[PDB]
Amino acid sequence: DVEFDALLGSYCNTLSLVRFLELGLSVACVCTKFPELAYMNEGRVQFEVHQPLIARDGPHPVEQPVHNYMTKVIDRRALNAAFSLATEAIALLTGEAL
Amino acid sequence: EDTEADVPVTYGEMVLNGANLVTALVMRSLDDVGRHLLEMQEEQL
């Protein structure tokens, strides 16, 4: 008996792709691309910070401009996503048989 | 104060600044070792 049809009114949305850029957190992290990371043994981030200065009068007891070298250590992590296929579909995706 | 904001799209990239200088040759004067370096530097630019 059974007969099928598809309404055009709406569409169910199977799970929706979410970019990470569109979210709020994206602010907190500037994100760049290592073409490779894991090959690194250890790494660091190097940058300079002057110390600000305030001029004063009077016989100058002390001061001199100051730099800093701040270096902080990368932390390697990783994400894992499982995926599976039976042989039922492999032939189809493959091609002709012997 | 507002609803629709702007967001960056493309990720930040990186550039190689400095490297070990390592080359070779198969013996062409003896300066070509030098000239080949500038060659192999001119690539990275």
Binding site: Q46, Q64, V66, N68, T71 | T23, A24, M27, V33
Partner: peptide, 30 residues
Amino acid sequence: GSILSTIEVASHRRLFDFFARVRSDENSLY
């Protein structure tokens, strides 16, 4: 058929330190 490899000199300098006082972290390489 000999192979020639350029000698490599590795040294690091902090020229700006002379221009100004600095207090760099020990671990980091200036």
